[PDB]
A paper describes a structure:
Enterobacter agglomerans strain Eh1087 generates the phenazine antibiotic D-alanyl griseoluteic acid to compete with other microorganisms in its habitat. In order to protect itself against the toxic action of this compound, the bacterium produces the resistance protein EhpR together with enzymes required for phenazine biosynthesis. EhpR belongs to the glyoxalase I/bleomycin resistance protein family, whose members have a wide variety of functions extending from simple binding of toxic small molecules to their chemical conversion through enzymatic activity. The EhpR monomer consists of two βαββ'β fold units (' indicating antiparallel orientation with respect to the other strands) that are typical for members of the glyoxalase I/bleomycin resistance protein family.
Numbering used by the authors:
A (entry chain B), B (entry chain A): -2 to 129
The structure:
Amino acid sequence: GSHMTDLAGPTITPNLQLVYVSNVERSTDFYRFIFKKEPVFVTPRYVAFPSSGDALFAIWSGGEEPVAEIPRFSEIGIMLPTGEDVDKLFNEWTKQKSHQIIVIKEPYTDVFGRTFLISDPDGHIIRVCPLD
Amino acid sequence: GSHMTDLAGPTITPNLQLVYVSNVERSTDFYRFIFKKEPVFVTPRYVAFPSSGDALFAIWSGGEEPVAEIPRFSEIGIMLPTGEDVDKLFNEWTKQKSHQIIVIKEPYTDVFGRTFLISDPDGHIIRVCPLD
Ligand SMILES: COc1ccc(C=O)c2nc3cccc(C(=O)O)c3nc12
């Protein structure tokens, strides 16, 4: 070709979503349950789960320990194909008994569509909604 | 009738990384600059950028406004092909003259290799680190 397209560095993508956890074992168990998936990389302080493409979601005990009382300003979002899927997942999580699932917001409509919020063991906010 | 017996729900993936922002237009400009990409969609309150694959990174003014000095317990991560790419990006971002970038931590080798930290306009932590 005549196409010198690789002279400006690698692409810059927010391909990691990382949350600080108090205990990696407990959070690994929690996210295995939420995602119905095994992690792709496991170490005692850092565990990664797949996202789309080359992106990852990771839990890490090397940051600052989360404090329950402190308000949070970001969310771990899970986009499902349809609004029916959102309601089915809410029903599944709130009916099953083994795993504690803390509901923060009941299903409602927001900018995302039909959506609900739960908390993880360290107070991280998880949103379920439809695909864009 | 149906010839399918699969009763599984849809794949559950953390495919939305969402942060709360005070000034959507300001944050749109910031992220357009650091990602060198246009948003997928823009509304007054809600803007998304591509992450990898089908995943998105989004900014939203409809949550709770982030407050300076409230500690944060999560990071927006940017994973690059090599450690050398990490140092090169820090040089690029600190050399350019057109956008203020607040540096939290200059480059160094952590337990996972070369890394640095910056802040976004609303105090969200952004980490640059290596894939490998
Ligand atoms: C923020 O933390 C990380 C980011 C990206 C990584 C790339 O795979 C990564 N890998 C690790 C491998 C071993 C141990 C740790 C640890 O932090 O103890 C790791 N932490 C990592």
